[PDB]
């Protein structure tokens, strides 16, 4: 019925690429869950892949009203896709607990990227 | 009621300008309906005009859940404005058929551009 | 509860910084209410602070459906924050009068910035 939260985020792709060039998997694993890493490792544009997931998760954390804090971690969010490529967001851990407290029934996520920037928006509704 | 789709897109204006300098009307006509072409032709900043429409339409195609695919074309989306300048989105063709299947009753669109980027967000609600 | 409006906006931070270097308070006071100026004055990154507020207010004005026109001014939008850092939008002046006529009961705002750009999205719900 009503919107419980709204979140948006923009990420500079070159910054994510630089971080991967320096710290690689140590950096990717802080952001991605084990299930997401398979898809990540398969990509030939890993910085772009990670930039999008980073924007999506930050946008989700803001829609929750906590950001990546108060027990909410990047691993509480998992990004997947439907059969036509639409991105989907699934919550776990503290994010799932807060969503339940807020009575969230539907989650909407959209992602976009151009050469230099990735962005995402998330809406939680009850 | 509830949100049935969310879409967002960011477009680099310079790439649109380069495409117009090379292919002009042939490129513009792939994105714009005949009705929209009249407004486009009267514009004195065509690359900027077209980048905004491009972002709006891709955002709308993501809100429908298909992208520009599965029979959904750029011509299935028409952008107009109300008397105060608010952008309005009207669907046709396969986009309209899918929206009808999604029970879409209200469509919201917002657009913004700065010197180098144009972006848009679309929300479909039932 | 349906969506009354949606607004989005992107702002180039260096343009805001340049404006401040030239016009300072004359510029800042056009965008910010006296109450918001207190927080602004305490910031050590005033250009970035102001770029975010500028984006939030422009987005809010688009969600209302008027833009910054028709008696609606930048001062009709006040950005505050909750204890966890979530941004909150409160309307006044003509914006509040119009929102009341539209039966707006819930307002949602999200803001994000990266090195060069600030962006925001606003949704008004009845
Ligand atoms: C908000 C967060 C997710 C992102 O921070 P950031 O990249 O500086 O944020 P962005 O510029 O995209 O967003 C800043 C805006 O987010 C919004 N925000 C902050 N806290 C929020 C909250 N609890 N809920 C919703 N929105 C929030 C605010 O509008 C803020 O700007 P403002 O304070 O001027 O209004 C933050 O919780 C965070 O970065 N936490 C730690 C993340 C981390 O571990 N980082 C290491 C890198 S892997
Ligand atoms: C999705 C589409 C609309 C835009 O493609 P794009 O510009 O590469 O996409 P963007 O970079 O803006 O966004 C990519 C994201 O869109 C989202 N997306 C993809 N398919 C989607 C769908 N069916 N529904 C909703 N969102 C979708 C995804 O999150 C994707 O990123 P991810 O796969 O890493 O999660 C695509 O269907 C398209 O444009 N197809 C035809 C190609 C075309 O005509 N191009 C223009 C030529 S002039
Ligand atoms: C909408 C406004 C807030 C910003 O316009 P802008 O600088 O062109 O900003 P953007 O590029 O971000 O937005 C343009 C889009 O906003 C949208 N828009 C315009 N009027 C709108 C309205 N009444 N309601 C909702 N959206 C609107 C349109 O989609 C427009 O693009 P289009 O005409 O190509 O479709 C406008 O009312 C304005 O500039 N007011 C004056 C603000 C001011 O005082 N500026 C001085 C600089 S401090
Ligand atoms: Ca961020
Ligand atoms: Ca892209
Ligand atoms: Ca795109
Ligand atoms: Ca502009
Ligand atoms: Ca603007
Ligand atoms: Ca930032
Ligand atoms: Cl234009
Ligand atoms: Cl700041």
Author numbering:
A (entry chain B), B (entry chain A), C (entry chain C): 0 to 125
Please, what does the article write about this entry?
The active form of ACP is produced by a post-translational modification of a conserved serine residue of apo-ACP by a 4′-phosphopantetheine (P-pant) group transferred from CoA bound to a holo-(acyl-carrier-protein) synthase (AcpS). AcpS belongs to the phosphopantetheine transferase (PPT) family of proteins, binds CoA and its derivatives and requires magnesium for activity. The AcpS trimer binds three CoA molecules and three ACP molecules. The AcpS monomer has an elongated elliptical shape and possesses an α/β fold.
24 polypeptide chains of AcpSVC are arranged in eight trimers in the P21 asymmetric unit. Three molecules of CoA were modeled per trimer. The pantothenate parts of all CoAs have two kinks of ∼100–110° that might be forced by intramolecular and intermolecular protein–ligand contacts. The high thermal factors and observed conformational diversity of the P-pant moiety can be explained by the mechanism of the reaction, in which accessibility of the group is essential. Whether the purification tag was present or absent, crystals of apo-AcpSBA and apo-AcpSVC only diffracted to low resolution.
